[PDB]
């Protein structure tokens, strides 16, 4: 302390910090309010401190693919620690340096084309689960919260996919399962208070609720000697020039890919079942192309879902709008100079993809649900480093594959069965919550009619 005057020693301009708050009541709008304002109050670059953590925002598009692709393993490796995470330290996400690098090797082939397209069946078969819970309601015309249908969807393919683990969680039971995994303020005292962490990772106090955690824990451990398709398999298989996945190692990921998948998956489904809504020419175009590929209903597959461009198209302009990761960030770990600009060591560097996302100088009527953007004609326009909802470079999402096909493959068999209508009770138009995570102000609640 005080590193309040880094910025305006480098020139780089930005808003004036408070003493120990830095910037953070800016964040009473939410992040993405906060970004779009820096990004007009003070163009292609600005900082600002999370309290006495510098942090500098880029948005130039050649400096993003320094920052994310040239000088990845070298210098912006890592993301900001939050914590305390206990074990959890050895997650792919959390990790850093040498030992990120490690498991990003152990866990990549897990994520191939290949291996996601035998998936695939068992990624099929809840969708058949998804329409029957969904017709339960649509018999019954009452009003449907997508959040709760799709959670539980999305819940269902996670613990099958990941474990083999076989539940209907919206109704089939209390099956031993879905509640661990139902756990499925403190984050901004982390802000103000960084120093703390040590305090807490000394107490052991985990964020993974550390009861959830002992029950994996013991639940993966009862699963790998009952066996001695799925990720834990993928990884059971890899553990038999790095050191081979650890028993732990391997239940930690576990829960990152659960949570990857859950809150992700369902709420980016969310966002898109409410867009269609609200779009219903766009819908109608969806299920035509749908019917075309897949006549009769016919069951998608692997191959038939890449076929479906439109589809394609309403995925990625969604992820426009909606991108859940809001920021991408990468630690500074070194001095160094990209793109003529000093960056000195320990600034945190953040691409501001809401923001990117929703700038009019790269997007016409950037507010606007306009899938269209993405046509084959127009998609060769669009700078990969200003629409990056997966990220990019070597540390960008491992599950993108998987997310998009598991997402395409829940719209597809929904839109070959029903139709989707905004209630009066439907948030039209949707507010972003003010909060820390994208998600709805209110939760999308829908009208859900047989076709
Ligand atoms: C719509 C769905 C998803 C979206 C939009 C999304 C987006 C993102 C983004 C923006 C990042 C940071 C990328 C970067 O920093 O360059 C990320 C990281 C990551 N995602 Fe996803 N994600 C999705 C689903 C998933 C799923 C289903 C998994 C399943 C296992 C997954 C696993 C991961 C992991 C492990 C990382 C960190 C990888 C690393 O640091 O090595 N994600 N995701
Ligand atoms: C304090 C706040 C909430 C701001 O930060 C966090 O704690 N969240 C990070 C920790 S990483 C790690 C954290 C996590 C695990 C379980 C529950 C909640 C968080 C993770 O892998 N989650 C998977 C994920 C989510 C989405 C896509 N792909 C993958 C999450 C993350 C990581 C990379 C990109 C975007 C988000």
């Given at each position: 302390?005080?590193?309040?005057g880094?910025?305006?020693?480098?020139?780089?301009?930005?808003?004036?910090?408070?003493?120990?708050?830095?910037?953070?009541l800016?964040?009473?709008?939410?992040?993405?309010?906060?970004?779009?304002?820096?990004?007009?109050?003070?163009?292609?670059?600005?900082?600002?401190?999370?309290?006495?953590?510098?942090?500098?925002?880029?948005?130039?598009?050649?400096?993003?693919?320094?920052?994310?692709?040239?000088?990845?393993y070298s210098?912006?490796?890592?993301?900001?620690?939050?914590?305390?995470?206990?074990?959890?330290?050895?997650?792919?996400?959390?990790?850093?340096?040498?030992?990120?690098?490690?498991?990003?090797?152990?866990?990549?082939?897990?994520?191939?084309?290949?291996?996601?397209?035998?998936?695939?069946?068992?990624?099929?078969?809840?969708?058949?689960?998804?329409?029957?819970?969904l017709?339960?309601?649509?018999?019954?015309?009452?009003?449907?919260?997508?959040?709760?249908?799709?959670?539980?969807?999305?819940?269902?393919?996670?613990?099958?996919?990941?474990?083999?683990?076989?539940?209907?969680?919206?109704?089939?039971?209390?099956?031993?399962?879905?509640?661990?995994?139902?756990?499925?303020?403190?984050?901004?005292?982390?802000?103000?208070?960084?120093?703390?962490?040590?305090?807490?990772?000394?107490?052991?106090?985990?964020?993974?609720?550390?009861?959830?955690?002992?029950?994996?824990?013991?639940?993966?451990?009862?699963?790998?000697?009952?066996?001695?398709?799925?990720?834990?398999?993928l990884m059971?298989?890899?553990?038999?020039?790095?050191?081979?996945?650890?028993?732990?190692?391997?239940?930690?990921?576990?829960?990152?890919?659960?949570?990857?998948?859950?809150?992700?998956?369902?709420?980016?489904?969310?966002?898109?079942?409410?867009?269609?809504?609200?779009?219903?020419?766009?819908?109608?175009?969806?299920?035509?192309?749908?019917?075309?590929?897949?006549?009769?209903?016919?069951?998608?597959?692997?191959?038939?879902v890449?076929?479906?461009?439109?589809?394609?198209?309403?995925?990625?302009?969604?992820?426009?709008?909606?991108?859940?990761?809001m920021?991408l960030?990468?630690?500074?770990?070194?001095?160094?100079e990209i793109?003529?600009?000093?960056?000195?060591?320990?600034?945190?560097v953040?691409?501001?993809?809401?923001?990117?996302?929703?700038?009019?100088?790269?997007?016409?009527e950037?507010?606007?649900?306009?899938?269209?953007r993405?046509?084959?004609?127009n998609?060769?326009?669009?700078?990969?480093?200003?629409?990056?909802?997966?990220?990019?470079?070597?540390?960008?999402?491992?599950?993108?594959?998987?997310?998009?096909?598991?997402?395409?493959?829940?719209?597809?068999?929904?839109?070959?069965?029903?139709?989707?209508?905004?209630?009066?009770?439907?948030?039209?138009?949707?507010?972003?919550?003010l909060?820390?995570?994208?998600?709805?102000?209110?939760?999308?609640?829908?009208?859900?009619?047989?076709?």
């Amino acid at each position: 302390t005080h590193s309040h005057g880094l910025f305006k020693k480098l020139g780089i301009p930005g808003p004036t910090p408070l003493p120990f708050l830095g910037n953070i009541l800016s964040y009473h709008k939410g992040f993405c309010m906060f970004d779009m304002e820096c990004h007009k109050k003070y163009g292609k670059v600005w900082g600002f401190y999370d309290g006495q953590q510098p942090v500098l925002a880029i948005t130039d598009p050649d400096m993003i693919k320094t920052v994310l692709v040239k000088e990845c393993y070298s210098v912006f490796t890592n993301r900001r620690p939050f914590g305390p995470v206990g074990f959890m330290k050895s997650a792919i996400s959390i990790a850093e340096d040498e030992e990120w690098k490690r498991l990003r090797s152990l866990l990549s082939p897990t994520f191939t084309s290949g291996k996601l397209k035998e998936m695939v069946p068992i990624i099929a078969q809840y969708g058949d689960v998804l329409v029957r819970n969904l017709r339960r309601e649509a018999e019954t015309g009452k009003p449907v919260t997508l959040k709760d249908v799709f959670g539980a969807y999305s819940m269902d393919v996670i613990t099958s996919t990941s474990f083999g683990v076989n539940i209907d969680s919206l109704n089939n039971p209390q099956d031993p399962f879905v509640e661990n995994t139902k756990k499925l303020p403190f984050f901004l005292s982390i802000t103000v208070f960084p120093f703390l962490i040590p305090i807490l990772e000394v107490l052991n106090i985990c964020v993974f609720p550390r009861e959830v955690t002992n029950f994996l824990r013991k639940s993966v451990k009862r699963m790998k000697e009952s066996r001695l398709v799925d990720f834990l398999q993928l990884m059971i298989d890899s553990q038999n020039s790095h050191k081979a996945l650890s028993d732990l190692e391997l239940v930690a990921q576990s829960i990152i890919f659960i949570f990857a998948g859950y809150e992700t998956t369902s709420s980016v489904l969310s966002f898109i079942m409410y867009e269609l809504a609200t779009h219903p020419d766009v819908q109608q175009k969806l299920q035509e192309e749908i019917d075309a590929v897949l006549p009769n209903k016919a069951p998608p597959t692997y191959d038939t879902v890449l076929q479906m461009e439109y589809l394609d198209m309403v995925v990625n302009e969604t992820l426009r709008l909606f991108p859940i990761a809001m920021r991408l960030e990468r630690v500074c770990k070194k001095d160094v100079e990209i793109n003529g600009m000093f960056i000195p060591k320990g600034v945190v560097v953040m691409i501001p993809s809401y923001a990117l996302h929703r700038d009019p100088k790269y997007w016409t009527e950037p507010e606007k649900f306009l899938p269209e953007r993405f046509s084959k004609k127009n998609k060769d326009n669009i700078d990969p480093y200003i629409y990056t909802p997966f990220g990019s470079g070597p540390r960008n999402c491992i599950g993108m594959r998987f997310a998009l096909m598991n997402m395409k493959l829940a719209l597809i068999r929904v839109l070959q069965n029903f139709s989707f209508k905004p209630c009066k009770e439907t948030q039209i138009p949707l507010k972003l919550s003010l909060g820390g995570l994208l998600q709805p102000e209110k939760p999308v609640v829908l009208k859900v009619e047989s076709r």
